Design a protein around this ligand. Structure first.
Ligand code: NAG
Ligand code: NAG
Length: 115
């Protein structure tokens, strides 16, 4: 089974396997596709981070590198960095995936508009 962000921010979800090993670049694209999504771009993860999205996992994006979005500093997540941090790695390296849902328009898929 796959782990997925409970609430997507600017259409972005972190997607990973429930146990290691995680996913090379090809596997990451395939995982998003199996969910009916696409691999997110760096720009899409940056937009999510600016809207409050952070994780403790590096994940593949469409530019063929991996990123981690960080808002608070934690030594276990991006070595206390803040921002969208980049990891240039071979396409064979295992990471999670950032997927983008083009049907999302709410900033947070769990927070509706006022009804
Ligand atoms: C990615 O993993 C798949 C197995 O799911 C493998 O067939 C493929 O060669 C791998 N690609 C790279 C670049 O490591
Ligand atoms: C994508 O978003 C739509 C609309 O919010 C939702 O119904 C659908 O389940 C989402 N799919 C995934 C894989 O998140």
């Amino acid at each position: 089974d796959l782990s997925i962000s409970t609430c997507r921010i600017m259409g972005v979800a972190l997607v990973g396997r429930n146990k290691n090993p995680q996913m090379n670049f090809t596997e990451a694209n395939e995982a998003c596709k199996m969910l009916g999504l696409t691999l997110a771009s760096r720009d899409q993860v940056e937009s999510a981070q600016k809207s409050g999205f952070e994780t403790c996992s590096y994940g593949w994006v469409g530019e063929q590198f991996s990123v981690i979005p960080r808002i608070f500093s934690n030594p276990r997540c991006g070595k206390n960095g803040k921002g969208v941090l980049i990891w240039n790695a071979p396409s064979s390296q295992k990471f999670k995936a950032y997927c983008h849902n083009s049907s999302d328009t709410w900033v947070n898929s769990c927070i509706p508009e006022i009804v």
